[PDB]
Ligand binder design. Structure first.
Ligand SMILES: CCCCCCCCCCCCP(C)(C)=O
Ligand SMILES: CCCCCCCCCCCCP(C)(C)=O
Lengths: 89, 104, 104, 89
């Protein structure tokens, strides 16, 4: 159900600007945890959180020319499956 | 006036109480937010009322308005069975509140 | 087991009540902090005692101890009125609260 | 009388570190509000609150060589008695 439509709004060799659809007011969660990592798995991933009143998020320090997986988790699994996309910088 | 503040404190208490169950695990932003605000306001106005009112009376009337708002909302909104017992109990509660204000 | 945790939750209820009275409207640090932490404690121990005991009777005994002990320690510490009327109307009020929370 | 002994601990052309006596643990308040402005007049007086678990506070962004008055208020003046000082940066 939420979040939906995770699209990379903008991109730079070393940075992505992503966004999602927070949904209707009764679907607005308190926070989304964004997780970005090399689309393979060199060692861990990388993760931060964003207040639920925000639908966009910037990601920096990415290796240029590398495909990354980017997931946007709701606080709990109740709201919906964690959406995620692939993008090569 | 402190009694009016106390009534309003009970009101915000029941409002944050129900917005709390409307927030799942403190995750829905809007309900969690209503609860946060209503908690702050309920407890703030409750403290202000306690500044001039006896604690055993202010707390009791605050909890009583919380319970009365909870039931009134359940019966009205969330479809709750209105029994003779619950009627008698709301009557006892309103009588207690009114008689406490009436012996100031 | 959870019965005594419920009892303790009610004790911390009256604790944060009396601590709120001493804080003169969240202005005196320590009574304000006893209030906040006693809140958190009572709510957590209520969640504990309620994941076992019936929410009806759990809330009934919880708010009963809270309100009654608040009235008591008010009559005692802050030497609040102990009239025939006030006590009778407090009886009506607390019985109404205990009854409404014992039927949900 | 909360607080007591408002003094400038450390100083700079542009900043003052002040401290006061929070009193006994039953005189401790939830917050102090500090005021500071040019002793001359000209404009109003800057202000900010400070947690009552703090006997010190720093005042930054000040004109060098200018004399400021600095008051420290409790929440209410029940036991309150606003203590002020003068300090020239
Ligand atoms: C979570 C506890 C309730 C919220 C705390 C409210 C703090 C307000 C402090 C009162 C200020 C006193 P005054 C006379 C300057 O308004
Ligand atoms: C409980 C006491 C914690 C301190 C609260 C004060 C917050 P403020 C008014 C300096 O932002």
């Amino acid at each position: 159900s939420v979040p939906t439509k995770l699209e990379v709004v903008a991109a730079t060799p070393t940075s992505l600007l992503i966004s999602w659809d927070a949904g209707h007011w009764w679907e607005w969660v308190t926070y989304y945890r964004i997780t970005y990592g090399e689309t393979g798995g060199n060692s861990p991933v990388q993760e931060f959180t964003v207040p639920g009143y925000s639908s966009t998020a910037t990601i920096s320090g990415l290796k240029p020319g590398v495909d990354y997986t980017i997931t946007v988790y709701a606080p709990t699994s109740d709201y919906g499956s964690p959406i995620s996309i692939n993008y090569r910088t | 006036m402190a009694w009016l503040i106390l009534i309003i404190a009970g009101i915000f208490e029941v409002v944050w109480a129900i917005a709390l169950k409307y927030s799942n695990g403190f995750t829905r932003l809007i309900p969690s937010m209503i609860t946060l605000i209503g908690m702050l306001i309920s407890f703030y106005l409750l403290s202000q009322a306690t500044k001039t009112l006896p604690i055993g009376t202010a707390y009791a009337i605050w909890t009583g308005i919380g319970a009365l708002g909870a039931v009134i909302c359940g019966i009205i909104f969330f479809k709750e069975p209105l029994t003779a017992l619950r009627i008698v109990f709301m009557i006892l509660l309103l009588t207690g509140i009114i008689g406490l204000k009436a012996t100031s």
